[PDB]
Write a protein that binds this ligand. Structure first.
Ligand SMILES: NC(=O)C1=CN([C@@H]2O[C@H](COP(=O)(O)OP(=O)(O)OC[C@H]3O[C@@H](n4cnc5c(N)ncnc54)[C@H](OP(=O)(O)O)[C@@H]3O)[C@@H](O)[C@H]2O)C=CC1
Ligand SMILES: COc1cc(-c2ccccc2)cc([C@@H](C)C#Cc2c(C)nc(N)nc2N)c1
Length: 225
């Protein structure tokens, strides 16, 4: 019952997110959004968790890891079990799924996690479509003059739009209430797709903060004793 939220910056239309182990852009404003969203809580006595794969961990500059003021979890199949403190601010897990179950125990967590953010990378996100309750996706578009950057890692847009709908009308309300956003909400056609969310521009790019929410489910089975 703590929300699990995938958070990702992706280039349209392919939803590219990475190239040779690194982000394909450096956008200070996007990074500020990610920082504030994953750090900030509505309740001052809680922190959020950020969960990431080993390769993503290794790409964060050494001065900036672990990410401050958030519980960091790194997942590697070569680690020891399902959630182990290895250093201040650092947990290792050998299982994305079992670490989420572990993080959800109110006995372990004392109800002092607000949200669990899944912060990448590709392999991790592949596995999170059936785990996340919401996705915060920054939809990035090169302006007409901008060279499209090369990329090698992609968000699974098909599987996204299967399970989730664009709930960006509720993005403002979904974010911790102290964040301040520059744009107003905004529906724009771009290459035949509808892009809705909160606009910024930086460097060669325009980008929208968007929110995706699980679609309604039929009631097929509830488990009884
Ligand atoms: N634009 C964006 O918002 C973001 C983009 N990225 C990008 O993504 C790319 C990195 O993605 P990718 O290469 O797929 O790597 P990941 O960051 O997803 O790491 C993959 C590694 O995580 C571990 N892992 C994966 N699944 C599990 C599991 N179920 N249980 C335990 N461990 C698991 C394995 O570690 P091991 O090999 O040790 O066993 C695996 O090799 C980079 O280009 C990066 O820049 C990353 C974050 C955000
Ligand atoms: C691939 O190299 C990376 C470097 C950093 C990083 C770079 C500088 C300072 C702190 C972190 C963060 C990341 C990851 C953890 C991220 C991210 C992320 C961003 C920037 N935006 C959105 N919307 N979602 C994310 N998950 C990766």
């Amino acid at each position: 019952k703590v929300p699990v939220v995938g958070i990702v910056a992706a280039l349209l239309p392919e939803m590219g997110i990475g190239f040779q182990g690194n982000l394909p852009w450096r956008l200070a404003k996007e990074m500020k959004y990610f920082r504030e969203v994953t750090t900030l809580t509505n309740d001052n006595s809680k922190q959020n968790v950020v969960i990431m794969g080993r390769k993503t961990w290794e790409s964060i500059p050494q001065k900036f890891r672990p990410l401050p003021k958030r519980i960091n979890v790194v997942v590697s199949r070569s680690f020891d079990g399902e959630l182990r403190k290895v250093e201040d601010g650092i947990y290792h897990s050998n299982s994305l799924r079992n670490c989420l179950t572990a993080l959800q125990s109110s006995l372990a967590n004392e109800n002092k996690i607000e949200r669990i953010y899944i912060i990448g990378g590709g392999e991790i996100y592949r596995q999170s479509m059936d785990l996340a309750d919401h996705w915060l996706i920054t939809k990035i578009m090169p302006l007409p003059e901008t060279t499209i950057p090369q990329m090698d890692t992609f968000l699974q847009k098909q599987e996204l739009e299967q399970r989730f709908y664009d709930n960006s009308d509720k993005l403002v309300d979904f974010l911790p209430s102290s964040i301040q956003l520059e744009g107003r909400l905004t529906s724009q056609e771009w290459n035949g797709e509808l892009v809705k969310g909160l606009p910024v521009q930086e460097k060669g790019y325009q980008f929208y903060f968007t929110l995706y929410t699980k679609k309604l489910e039929h009631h097929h089975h509830h488990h009884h004793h």
